[PDB]
Amino acid sequence: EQIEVDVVAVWKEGYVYENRGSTSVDQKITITKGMKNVNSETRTVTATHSIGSTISTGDAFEIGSVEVSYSHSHEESQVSMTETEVYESKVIEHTITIPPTSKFTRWQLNADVGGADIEYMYLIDEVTPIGGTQSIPQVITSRAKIIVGRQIILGKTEIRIKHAERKEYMTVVSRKSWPAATLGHSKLFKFVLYEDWGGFRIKTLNTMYSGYEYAYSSDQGGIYFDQGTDNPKQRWAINKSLPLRHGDVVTFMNKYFTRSGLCYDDGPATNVYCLDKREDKWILEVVG
Amino acid sequence: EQIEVDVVAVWKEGYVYENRGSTSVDQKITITKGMKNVNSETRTVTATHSIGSTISTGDAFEIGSVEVSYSHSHEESQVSMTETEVYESKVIEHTITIPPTSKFTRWQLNADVGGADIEYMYLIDEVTPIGGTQSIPQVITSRAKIIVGRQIILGKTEIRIKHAERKEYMTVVSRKSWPAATLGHSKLFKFVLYEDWGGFRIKTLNTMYSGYEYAYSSDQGGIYFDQGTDNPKQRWAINKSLPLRHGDVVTFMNKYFTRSGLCYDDGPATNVYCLDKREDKWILEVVG
Amino acid sequence: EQIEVDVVAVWKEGYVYENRGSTSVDQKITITKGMKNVNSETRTVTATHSIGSTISTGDAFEIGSVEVSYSHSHEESQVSMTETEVYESKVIEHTITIPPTSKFTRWQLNADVGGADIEYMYLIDEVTPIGGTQSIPQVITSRAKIIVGRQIILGKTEIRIKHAERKEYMTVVSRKSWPAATLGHSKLFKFVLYEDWGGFRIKTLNTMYSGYEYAYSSDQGGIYFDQGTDNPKQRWAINKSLPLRHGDVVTFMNKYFTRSGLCYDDGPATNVYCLDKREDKWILEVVG
Amino acid sequence: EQIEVDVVAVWKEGYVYENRGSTSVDQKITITKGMKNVNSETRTVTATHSIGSTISTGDAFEIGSVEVSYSHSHEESQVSMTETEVYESKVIEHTITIPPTSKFTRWQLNADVGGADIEYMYLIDEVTPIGGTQSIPQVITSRAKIIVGRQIILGKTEIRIKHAERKEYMTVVSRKSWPAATLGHSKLFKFVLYEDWGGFRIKTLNTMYSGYEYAYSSDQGGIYFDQGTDNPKQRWAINKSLPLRHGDVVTFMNKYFTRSGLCYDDGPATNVYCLDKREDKWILEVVG
Amino acid sequence: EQIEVDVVAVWKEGYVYENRGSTSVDQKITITKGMKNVNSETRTVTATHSIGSTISTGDAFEIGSVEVSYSHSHEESQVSMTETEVYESKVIEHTITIPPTSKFTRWQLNADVGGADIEYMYLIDEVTPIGGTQSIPQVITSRAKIIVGRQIILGKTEIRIKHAERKEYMTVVSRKSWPAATLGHSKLFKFVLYEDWGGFRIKTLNTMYSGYEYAYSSDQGGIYFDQGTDNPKQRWAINKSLPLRHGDVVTFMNKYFTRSGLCYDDGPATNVYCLDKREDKWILEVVG
Amino acid sequence: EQIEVDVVAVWKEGYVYENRGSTSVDQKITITKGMKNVNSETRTVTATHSIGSTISTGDAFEIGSVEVSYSHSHEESQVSMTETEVYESKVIEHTITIPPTSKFTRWQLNADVGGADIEYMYLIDEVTPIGGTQSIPQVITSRAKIIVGRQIILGKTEIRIKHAERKEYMTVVSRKSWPAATLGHSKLFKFVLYEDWGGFRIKTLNTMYSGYEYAYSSDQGGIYFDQGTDNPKQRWAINKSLPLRHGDVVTFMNKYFTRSGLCYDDGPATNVYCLDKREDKWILEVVG
Amino acid sequence: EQIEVDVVAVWKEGYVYENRGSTSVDQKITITKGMKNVNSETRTVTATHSIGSTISTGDAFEIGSVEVSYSHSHEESQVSMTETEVYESKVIEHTITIPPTSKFTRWQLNADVGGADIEYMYLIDEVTPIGGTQSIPQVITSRAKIIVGRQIILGKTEIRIKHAERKEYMTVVSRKSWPAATLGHSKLFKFVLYEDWGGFRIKTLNTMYSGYEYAYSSDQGGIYFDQGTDNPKQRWAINKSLPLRHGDVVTFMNKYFTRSGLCYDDGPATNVYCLDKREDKWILEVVG
């Protein structure tokens, strides 16, 4: 089920090499791009035992005083660091033999695909004789055909929500005596996105307490589930325009709490919050 | 005993290279992905001995005072750091000679297999002439055939539980005068998963105290074994839908304590707890 | 829709190699240029419990005093560093065999394209016999043809604003009871640039409160939206001369607050400010 | 519009290799030159809460005293480092097979071009038989032909000033109720250099307040714009002798404040100052 | 305008390799020499706000005392490191196949050229059969022909002085109401070296105050310009014997202040001093 | 003017490889030897401003006391590190194909040449069949022919003294009202070594004060010049036996102060001292 | 003057590789052994100037007190680190193609030569078919022929003593009014080893005070020279059995002070001591 689309590729970085000499030139251009995230968690437990003892004689031994301050201190400290480095590089080398009196031109464009919100690095290497009218592509526009996943029909489509950075699915647990959203490795928990005039409602199918089905943000910040109402707190706002599709990255922004968005945070007894300035990317996928 | 399945591969990262020049181009793309975990445990023992002695004369030697504060301090400190670095990389290089007036297109998809919860990196390299209608695959869906292990029949199947990160099996030991779960290298300890209307019950076969067979979470957090009851504390919730199979990664989430899950933690005299926000991955395997 | 333009390339770095010997020489020149940005965020929580106890006897036990100061201190500290290294290199090697009694000359120019504000590294390698009249290019001027994107018609063109460094779009949220600009991953929010005699007005289409449409800077610094007036606070100044085009990097400088410019900053409940000495680069793109 | 010039190349570093043996020798000489600039900006926020409580009994409980000093301290510190490494290397390898009974001689000269103030590394490799009269070039003088940019006619030439290190153009903003120079990404701001008997005057075309056109240094240090007068404060001194040309690196030194020069500095509400011992390099370029 | 000269090359480092076996041996000797200079400049701004409050009750609440010392401290510190690494390596590899029953001998001499004060690394590789009378060159003397720059005629030669390490020319500015020497990027400032019976006088041509022409050292240390006198303070001593030539590295040592020499130092409002134990190398060059 | 000499090479390190198999073996042995000296000089300037204010009420507000200790502290610290790394490596690789049933034997000897005090690494690689009587060379003695520089005739030979580590010549300056030795870049200063029955006298030719010609050590440690006397303080002791030659490394040890030797040290207003336990190597060279 | 000897090579490390497959296998085994010694010497000079001023009003301003404690502190610290890294590696690679159904066996023995106290790494690589009776060499004994230096005749042989680690010869200087041993670069100082019934006596030839010739250890520890006596303090004990030879590494252990040995140590005014637990290796060599 593919769809046509207008891709646009804006410039990023160019490079030209005008070989004028009689000899040819071998040329190698390596573009490296590398992320490296490290998450350390040191716990330290220091324990000191100090025994001070001062012997002083000023009043009775009149003429002056001798104050002998002995002191001892045994300090036992136990540290325990725990790093977790994760790194990802992408080297891209291109070896080209540039002929004599030919200029080589690399144009690195960043091709952003419309609709789908996909982007890809679009290099353009040319080798042509000199002198000539140089054609620098500031913005290229290509007509692409995206092969696309199954469309999510809002209402009557069971989709499981997944956090993109964590790779942990959205689950339902009982905080207080209320159903509440939490990140978890379980794929059993499913959701159904609904659309009213107000906005998007995330309804659960697997809920502990019966009736309490539609997700909403509390005054505190945490996510709980309530009954279907006309409350703007239980509505949400999706970043991508309809229709929603398989493997679609979205960011649920609360309608009442306009600033805040559905996100991960290390809270007490719940870890899916609607905090101010938090637009966490949720990949949503469909069940078989 | 293989089974059919719908694999789906969502986009991750793309890359295009439009060679337009008369000369061909050799191209090398190295994708590195490397984890590195380091676990240090420093113990430090400092020991100071300080001998202060102050001689003061203000009262008797009237006009002012001379206060001579001598002091000494011998500090013997012994440190003992112990790191344990473990690193795992996976470099993936692809050398390709791109012909003249041909574009090369790499599409990196992340192929998530349905049911089994397996995922794999699915690269798609193409080399085709220009200009042409570009076909960007946002979501590919493939029909795969998983060769699958032996199915776990809930009741009448002896399975030993194993912690995925630690590679240590679940064992039974006597905490207080109660059988309790602990991580250990022994494979002799076996379990039988049962399913009632409430949820999943982890029953032991090798227990110290007779009768106390089914796993349950205490008010404290630690795991103990009790008799068969209608208590939701002794039920559990598995992340993968049935049927359970060999080499299946699961996360046992307590039914009463909805937030907490069966997990590893450095506690006193037991190291398998049901702590809040802890979904530790247990690979469960079948005995021969 | 391409346009002609005068490119100018000013000198950066030169290099000459006069091989005079009878034997030829293989020559390899690697130009590396590498950025590496690292963003750590350590949170530390130290917790000390100290129990001092001093036993002193000076008054009653007359002749001097024995002051025995015992003390204890248990210090539990938990650190949690989180780095996020991102690095980008660009190595450029050129292997050339220089013949006998020939000089090789590399001239590295930095070719700045006019109008479009694009720049690219322009190397010039020559190989010629010796001795000869050396031709050093301080400033080359080339006539280029920029392939350019769709032109933004000021008024009647829906453009979404995007922060260049963050790759986050400009969005509208309700700060206080006022519509206010914020960075966000949502592409649904669109803007229309207007031009009066005073300057450039950024009007929103998707606003929460009706009427409050045109962006303006407050006395505090934060960006809010107001009605259309003759106020210089709601005007702005764009760095590139007209016409504005697709994928155009701009810097909106407030007309009233001449120093300040539309920018990202970690504020409370809004993150798009007009702070003094802040010229953040906004790529603006057109909707399909 | 090229011009002739006398290039002079003074010695830097030599190297000789006298192969005397019957076998030839392959020789590889790599000259690396690498800059690496790193700009970190750590912000740290420590927050301690300490609750000391001491219970003492000396007066009433007569014979001595027991002073029990309990104390607590919770220290929450949040660090946030942000490095920005930028590195640039230039490796230059030359592989040469030196024949038997031939000496190889590399002479590295630093060729400084006259007038234009351009410099380039000028290597001289020779391979010749032995023994012979060695010709060491301490100072070579070459006649070059610089291809030069468009000449700046002082008065009636609109030139935009650009900071070389920052790559940020000179702009005009309103500090106090006075037009003042600031660095900015806007290319709209233009200047016209004038020459009187006193010195060089930097006049603006785009000024906020009408009349206040010519740049001058204040008693504080900051740059403002005033009317045309016979004041030496508004004159300047350019490092390169006339005529000024496209892509010309200059350093504007104030005539009154002889020590100080037009430069970048992080001041409050203006960032282009005339500070003592500051000769910042301004590339000045011409408008199309 | 070349001149003959006696080069002398004293030993540095030798190496011999006596291959005695029937098989030949490939041999690679890499001599690396690498400088790396790093110049960091960290600025740190710490700001603490601490609110201590102690509540004590000893006098009225008679029997002992409870002293409850609460305390708070918010410490905001901003660091800003700025390194500037510059590195220069020179690897020199020589691959040689040593034949059977032949010894290879490398002798590294450091060839210091007379008069001109130029030096160069002079390797001597030999390959000869064994056994033989070994000829170790402790000191070689070669007759070279230096190609030399234009001679500086003392009086009637305009030369601009340049600091070798900084690559900044000597300039004249007004410190107090006196002309004073400073480092600067301007090449407009010229000097004329004069020679009397006493020593060398550095006269300026471009001076602010008329008459004050000849350089001299003050009692403080800084360099100013005075009228022509018989004062030894305004004389100087050059390290190289006459005649002075183009691209000549010199060190101006004051005649009165025999220890001190013309040098760079970060002083207030002047940066060219005559400090004790400072022999900074000034390259002096001639104007076209 | 070459001279014969007995070289002796004592053992350092051996290595044997007995290939017994039917297949041959390629073998590569890399001997690396690398020095790396780093000279950092950090200057730090911390500046604190602290404003404490305590409000206390105990006497008047009778029953106890409230002591509110507010405090503030602004700490501005500026650091400025400056490293200067210099590194020198010498890798020596030897690739050899060892034939079947042949042993390869490397013997690394350190060949110390007599008289001249030159040393060089003397490797001996052999390849021979097995089994055989192994010939291990503990001490080899070779007859070499040193090509030697011009001999220094003690008296009537102008030689300039040079510090080996610093590469700075010995110069004469006026400390107090006395001529004194200092390190400097000037080659104009010359010396003449004289030999009496007592020892070696370093006489200057270029001296400021007439008569004060012969070098001597003071009671303080610094080097000054005095008239010719029978004082042992002005005599010296050279490490190499006569005759002295060009490029000869010597260590001048004072005859009176037997422990101390002529050396470099950072003193006030003189930097050539005769300190205890200081045998700095002076290369002495002859003038043309 | 060679001598026969029994070499013995004890096992160190083995390695076997049994290739059983039909395809051959290329195999590369790199043994690296690398020493790296770094000797830093940081000198730091901190200088604080602190101006505290407290204004207090409690007595007169009755009801409580305001105590305003202002304070200032300017801390100027200058650090100066100086590392001196010296590293030496020895990589040893052996590339071998192991044929099908052949096992490769490396046995690394450490061959210690008798008498001479020389040792060398003795590898044994074998390649043979499988299966076979494996012959593991725990201890090999080879008959070698050491080519040996000139024998030292105890009495009537002038030998100069040299410290192995420092490469500095033993010299004589006047500590107090006594001749004393010191390390120095001078080769003029010679010694003659004598042997009595008691032990070895190190006699000097070049001594300052006449008569005081034979080396002995003081009660302090330092080495001085005395007349010939029957004192065990002036005797010594050599580690190698007679006869002593050229380039012989020895350790002189005092006969009276049995624990202590002739060694280097940074003492005041002498640097050759006889300290407890110090067996410094002295290479002793013969004069020509």
Numbering used by the authors:
A (entry chain A), B (entry chain B), C (entry chain I), D (entry chain H), E (entry chain G), F (entry chain F), ...: 10 to 297
The authors write:
Lysenin, the defence protein of the earthworm Eisenia fetida, is produced by coelomocytes in the body fluid that form part of the earthworm's immune system. It is a member of the aerolysin family of small β-pore-forming toxins (β-PFTs) that include key virulence factors of a large number of bacterial pathogens, such as aerolysin produced by Aeromonas spp2, Clostridium perfringens epsilon toxin3 and Clostridium septicum α-toxin4, while Bacillus thuringiensis parasporin-2 has cytocidal activity against human cancer cells. Like most PFTs, lysenin is secreted as an inactive, water-soluble monomer. On binding to sphingomyelin (SM) in the eukaryotic cell membrane, the toxin undergoes significant changes to its secondary structure and forms oligomeric pre-pores on the membrane surface, as identified by electron crystallographic and high-speed atomic force microscopy studies, before inserting into the membrane, which leads to pore formation and consequent cell lysis.
Here we report the structure of lysenin in its nonameric membrane-inserted form determined by single particle cryo-EM, to 3.1 Å resolution. No other oligomeric species were identified during the 2D and 3D classification steps, indicating that lysenin pores are almost exclusively nonameric. The membrane-spanning region, measuring ∼35 Å, is clearly visible in filtered maps as a detergent-bound shell that delineates the boundaries of the lipid bilayer and is lined on the outside by hydrophobic residues, such as Phe, Tyr, Val and Ile. Hinging on the flexible coil between Val157 and Arg159 (spheres), the N-terminal cap domain swivels downwards by ∼20 Å and rotates inwards towards the central lumen by ∼35°.
